[PDB]
């Protein structure tokens, strides 16, 4: 399968006093591996996965330098955006940025991304071709035209197709015991009578990685969505994920219902039946 490296940055202005609050996190696929928090005492990029601790002091110094530089850039950006949107200095506002690259199953560059939001809404994004920009509104047109003139996309493309992919490959190798391992969901069904005549069947998927999964209920061989409930995939806290799907059924008719579980950790979809 393909793999991704993504960095997520959030900068929140603090009108009452001081510099913005800045949090940066790095992920390989669904695994967080680094973090920086401006409100933490270390003022360093910090490891959040064992395999990144294989990196020497030069890595941590280098990533700390770059992440602090990103924090200052976002601080500048918050000021500029308040200007673009004609906002007062009194309110708190948020800049978010995400960038990164995917490698395909062939171990080669597959795609790149670099995009920004302001106050929770799309602002500007590098397009799939990595050569041009999508500006969401007229304020973002200012940014787009400036970055086109300065050939920013060409600079980003070099990182996204080169450096980014090289590091992702390095991380995948060093962390192969976890990053390259799938954890198939541990599945089971529970039964909860809601009366003498109806019961809830809940189909559980636990301890899976990565997060992508599909759970579907069928009744007598056809998809059933009525009288179902599905929760959003949620983190277990130990690096894995959880999901469940439930249906209410007439007591005594449980055998008609099947839960179908699709996950890349499974050679073939599972079918559960009470």
């Amino acid at each position: 399968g393909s793999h991704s490296m993504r960095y997520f940055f959030t900068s929140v202005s603090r009108p009452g006093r001081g510099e913005p609050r800045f949090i940066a996190v790095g992920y390989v696929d669904d695994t967080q591996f680094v973090r920086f928090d401006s409100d933490a005492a270390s003022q360093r990029m910090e490891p959040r996965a064992p395999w990144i601790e294989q990196e020497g002091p030069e890595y941590w110094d280098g990533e700390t330098r770059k992440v602090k530089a990103h924090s200052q850039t976002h601080r500048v950006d918050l000021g500029t955006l308040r200007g673009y949107y004609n906002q007062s200095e009194a309110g708190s506002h948020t800049v978010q940025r995400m960038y990164g690259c995917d490698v395909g199953s062939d171990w080669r560059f597959l795609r790149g991304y670099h995009q920004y939001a302001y106050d929770g809404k799309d602002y500007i994004a590098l397009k799939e071709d990595l050569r041009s920009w999508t500006a969401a509104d007229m304020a973002a047109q200012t940014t787009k035209h400036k970055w086109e003139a300065a050939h920013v996309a060409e600079q980003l493309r070099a990182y996204l197709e080169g450096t980014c992919v090289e590091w992702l490959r390095r991380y995948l190798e060093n962390g192969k015991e976890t990053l390259q391992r799938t954890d198939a969901p541990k599945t089971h069904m529970t039964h909860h009578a809601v009366s003498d005549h109806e019961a809830t069947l809940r189909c559980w998927a636990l301890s899976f990685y990565p997060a992508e999964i599909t759970l579907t209920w069928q009744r007598d061989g056809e998809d059933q969505t009525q009288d179902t409930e599905l929760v959003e995939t949620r983190p277990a806290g130990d690096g894995t994920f959880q999901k469940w799907a439930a249906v209410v059924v007439p007591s005594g008719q449980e055998q008609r219902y099947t839960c179908h579980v699709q996950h890349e950790g499974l050679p073939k979809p599972l079918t559960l039946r009470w």
Partner: peptide, 10 residues
């Protein structure tokens, strides 16, 4: 690893 951004600004 992070991009080592000259730097580009909004």
């Amino acid at each position: 690893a992070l991009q080592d951004a000259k730097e580009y600004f909004i």
